[PDB]
Design an enzyme around this catalytic site. Sequence first.
Site, PDB file in Angstrom:
ATOM      1  N   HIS A 103       4.646  18.856   5.651  1.00 53.14           N
ATOM      2  CA  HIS A 103       4.383  20.295   5.814  1.00 53.14           C
ATOM      3  C   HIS A 103       4.595  21.011   4.490  1.00 53.14           C
ATOM      4  O   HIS A 103       5.595  21.706   4.290  1.00 53.14           O
ATOM      5  CB  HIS A 103       5.311  20.891   6.883  1.00 53.14           C
ATOM      6  CG  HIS A 103       5.225  20.203   8.214  1.00 53.14           C
ATOM      7  ND1 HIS A 103       4.211  20.446   9.114  1.00 53.14           N
ATOM      8  CD2 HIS A 103       6.038  19.293   8.803  1.00 53.14           C
ATOM      9  CE1 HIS A 103       4.394  19.709  10.196  1.00 53.14           C
ATOM     10  NE2 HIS A 103       5.495  18.999  10.034  1.00 53.14           N
ATOM     11  N   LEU A 104       3.659  20.820   3.570  1.00 50.52           N
ATOM     12  CA  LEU A 104       3.810  21.374   2.220  1.00 50.52           C
ATOM     13  C   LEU A 104       4.072  22.870   2.152  1.00 50.52           C
ATOM     14  O   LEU A 104       4.787  23.327   1.265  1.00 50.52           O
ATOM     15  CB  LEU A 104       2.564  21.085   1.400  1.00 50.52           C
ATOM     16  CG  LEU A 104       2.262  19.617   1.157  1.00 50.52           C
ATOM     17  CD1 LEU A 104       1.015  19.553   0.248  1.00 50.52           C
ATOM     18  CD2 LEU A 104       3.460  18.906   0.522  1.00 50.52           C
ATOM     19  N   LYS A 105       3.465  23.634   3.054  1.00 50.31           N
ATOM     20  CA  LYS A 105       3.536  25.087   2.966  1.00 50.31           C
ATOM     21  C   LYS A 105       4.726  25.687   3.714  1.00 50.31           C
ATOM     22  O   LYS A 105       4.928  26.891   3.694  1.00 50.31           O
ATOM     23  CB  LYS A 105       2.185  25.714   3.412  1.00 50.31           C
ATOM     24  CG  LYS A 105       1.018  25.263   2.484  1.00 50.31           C
ATOM     25  CD  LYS A 105      -0.359  25.743   2.888  1.00 50.31           C
ATOM     26  CE  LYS A 105      -1.427  24.966   2.099  1.00 50.31           C
ATOM     27  NZ  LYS A 105      -2.815  25.508   2.190  1.00 50.31           N
ATOM     28  N   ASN A 106       5.542  24.836   4.331  1.00 51.61           N
ATOM     29  CA  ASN A 106       6.662  25.314   5.157  1.00 51.61           C
ATOM     30  C   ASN A 106       7.863  25.678   4.303  1.00 51.61           C
ATOM     31  O   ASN A 106       8.363  24.835   3.554  1.00 51.61           O
ATOM     32  CB  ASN A 106       7.048  24.221   6.160  1.00 51.61           C
ATOM     33  CG  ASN A 106       8.175  24.632   7.080  1.00 51.61           C
ATOM     34  OD1 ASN A 106       9.324  24.818   6.643  1.00 51.61           O
ATOM     35  ND2 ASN A 106       7.866  24.756   8.368  1.00 51.61           N
TER      36      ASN A 106
END
Lengths: 335, 445
Positions: A103-106
Site C-alpha cells: 500500500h504505497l500511498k497509505n
Amino acid sequence: GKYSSDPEWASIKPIELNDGSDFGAMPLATISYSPEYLEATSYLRAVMAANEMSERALRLTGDIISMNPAHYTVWIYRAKILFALGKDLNEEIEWLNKVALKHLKNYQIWHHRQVLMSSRAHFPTLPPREQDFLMEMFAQDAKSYHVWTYRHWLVRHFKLWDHPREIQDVEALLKADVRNNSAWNHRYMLRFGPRDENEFDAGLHNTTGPSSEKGRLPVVDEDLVDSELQYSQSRILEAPENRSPWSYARGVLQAAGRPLSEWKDFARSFVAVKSSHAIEWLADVYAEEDGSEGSAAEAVKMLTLLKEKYDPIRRNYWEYRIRQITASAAHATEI
Amino acid sequence: VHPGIPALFREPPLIHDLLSTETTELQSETVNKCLPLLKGIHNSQKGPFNKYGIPALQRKDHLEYLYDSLEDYPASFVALDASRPWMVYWALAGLCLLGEDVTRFRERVISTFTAAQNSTGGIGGGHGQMSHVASSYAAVLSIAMVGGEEAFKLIDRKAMWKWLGKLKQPDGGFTVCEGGEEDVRGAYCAMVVHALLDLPLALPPEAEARQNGLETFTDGLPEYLSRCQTYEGGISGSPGSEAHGAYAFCALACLCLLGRPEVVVPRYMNIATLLPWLSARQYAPEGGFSGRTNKLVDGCYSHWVGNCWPLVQAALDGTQPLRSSVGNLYSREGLTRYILSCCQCKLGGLRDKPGKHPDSYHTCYALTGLSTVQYYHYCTDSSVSSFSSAFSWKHDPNFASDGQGSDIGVFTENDRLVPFHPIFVIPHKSAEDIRVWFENQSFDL
Ligand SMILES: CC(C)=CCC/C(C)=C/CC/C(C)=C/COP(=O)(O)OP(=O)(O)O
Ligand SMILES: [K+]
Ligand SMILES: [Zn+2]
C-alpha cells in the site's frame, strides 16, 4: 462466521453495527460492508470497549488491516497492544514492511512506524537495514510525502544529520532525478536544519526572531556554505530551468546571511534565456541589494521579461514586484 | 481553435531543458493531455463555449453526481469507512456551491453523525471509531450547512472540549486523534471546530498539556505554525517536511483564527518567501495549481492554494472599514480555464486532472476554487461574533469580464457559485449562524 464459530473468541460478545439505519432517518454515504468486515469490526468494538490487550486482539487487528489498512482506529489500538504485551517490535517492523510495500500511498502505516521506532528500549540505535528499506520505497515513488516525513523524523531521532547514508541517499535520488524537490528539502534539513535537542523542531533556524530573518544561522560554517553553493551551481548547469536548486541556494544564502549578489555573475550567464529562475534572481539582486542609480530600472526590465515571456501566468505577482520597486525608488528619489 | 484563447494556454512553456527525468516525463504528459481540452477541441467536452473559448460549468451533471455520491456504496469501497464524514461534507459543500438548499438533509445528517459521536467526546469515522479532528471538522461543517437547532444540539460541546484538550501537544500543535499524528491539518481542523462551537479558550483543568506550561488552546500555536515554514517560503505538514499547498492553507487559515491577517501572518510567517512560492504554484499552459515544487497541477489545489490568496491578500491590504488593494496576485483566468476546460468529467463530477476519474473530494474542491475566483473576499472591522476577525469576512462579487487583461473573470455569470468563507470553507451565513447560536448557549455543566 469465522470469529463467531471460533472457540478462541467464545468468551466475548461482539457489538453489532449501529449506523443509524433503524432508529430514525436514513444515514448518508453508507457502505454495504462485506460480511467478513462486519463481523471482524463487531469483535473489534467489543475488544476495544473492554480495553483488551491480548494475542487474539492483536491477530484481529492484523485481519482488519488486511481488509482495510485505512482504518486509523485499528492501527492505534494495535500499537497499544504491542506495547502492553511486550511484543517483539523487530518482528512487527518486518511485518509492517510488507504492508507498506503493498500500500504505497497509505500514510497511517508510516505514523505507526514512527510510533514503534520511537521506543528507545526496542530500538536504541538506527536499525542496520532501515535506510535501505526507505530506499526500496523511494525506488517506487521518489516523492512519497509520508516516507520523506518519516525520514525527517528518523534523522532527528537518531541524530543522523551527518550520517553519510543520509547525504548519499539524497545524492543518489538527485542523480536519478535532479528535479526531485523532496530530496532537496531533505538536503536542507541535513545541512542547515536546527539540531538543538532542547528546542522544539523547526524547519528553519531563528523562528524566535523577526520573520524576515527566519532561517538565519546563529553560527555559520563558511566552508560548508561554499561547498553547498558549489553543489547547487553544478546541479543547475545540468538543467537550468529546474526550480529546486535555485530555491535551495536562496535558502542557503539566507541561512548564511549572505546576499543574493554572490550569484550575480552566475545568474547573468543564463541571460537568449536558459533559465527563468536566473531572471528572477537578477530582479531581486538589482531591486534589493544594489543601491546604485539605474538598478531599479534593470529590476523592472527583468520582471517585464518574466511577465511578458518567461513566466507570464505569474504576471500579477511580477507586477506587484514592479509596483513595490517603483514605490521604493520613488521614496529613495525623494529623500 | 476559438479566438478567445490566448497563446499562453495553447502552447508548452518557451524554456525547455535538454535533460529528461521522471519529473519532466510526467510534466510533459500532463501538458499534452491538457492542451486539447484547453483549446476546447476535445470530443469529450460539452458546450456552450463562451467568448473566452471556455465550456460552461455543467451544473446539472455535477448536481446529479453529488446527489448520487450521498447514497450507498458497494463492499469494494470499504477503505472509505473512516472517511464517511468527509463524504457527507464534500457532497453538501458541492451542492451548496451549486446553489442547492441543503436544509432537507438535516434529519439524515443528524442520523449519520449521532452514531459517529463518542460519549467521551468528538466525532470519528463512524460507530466504534475513535474521535478524529478531521471527522469532527467534516461533521461540524456539515451540521453548519444544514443548520437548525436539532442538528446544533447533536454535539456534546463539553465532551468535545475535553477531548480536543487531550490533543494539545507541548510544542503548541495538535494530534489528529489520541495516539495519532501531529501535523498542521490537525491544528487547523481542531481550531475550526473550537471556533464554530464557541468552545472555551482555556484548556480543560486536567489537560496534560497544562503540565507543559500551556494554559489555552492557542498557547504556543502560532509559534508552532511558524516552525512549519520552510526555506522555500511555503509551509509543511510538520517541522522540516516539504512545503505543500494543502498545509499552507491549513496554517494560514489557522493563523487567521488567531487575529487579524495583517497582524498575525507577517508576524509568524516570512511573507517575502511565502509570496513567490505561492505564486509559483501556478503553471501555464495548464492554468491550475500544483501542491509542491516540481510536481503536477491538480484541481483540488484550486481550493488549497487558491484560498491561500484571499488570506495573504488580506495580510497585505489590512482590515477594510465599513482601501486600495494589492488585488489578485495570481491568474484567475488560468485557474478558471484549468477547472472548466480540463477538470470537468463528461458524465458529471470534477477531477484532479485529465486521465483521472472524478471523485466527490475533487468535485468539492474544484468548485470551491471556482467560487473563490468569482468573489472579492476581505476582512472588516465588523464581526458577527460577540476569533473576532475570523467572523468579520465579507464578500462582493467579482463580475465576469469582457476583453483581455491580467486579472479577469473568464467564467460566465451563468457559472456563478455561492461564495464560501475562506477560513471555514462553508457559506458565510452557515458559519455565522452556528457560531452565533453557540455563543448564545451557556457552556454545559
Ligand atoms: C483540512 C485538511 C484535511 C487539509 C489537508 C488536505 C490535504 C489534501 C492533505 C494532504 C497533503 C499532502 C501530504 C499530499 C501529498 O499527496 P500526493 O503526493 O498524492 O499529491 P501531490 O503530488 O500533489 O503532492
Ligand atoms: K483527513
Ligand atoms: Zn487532488
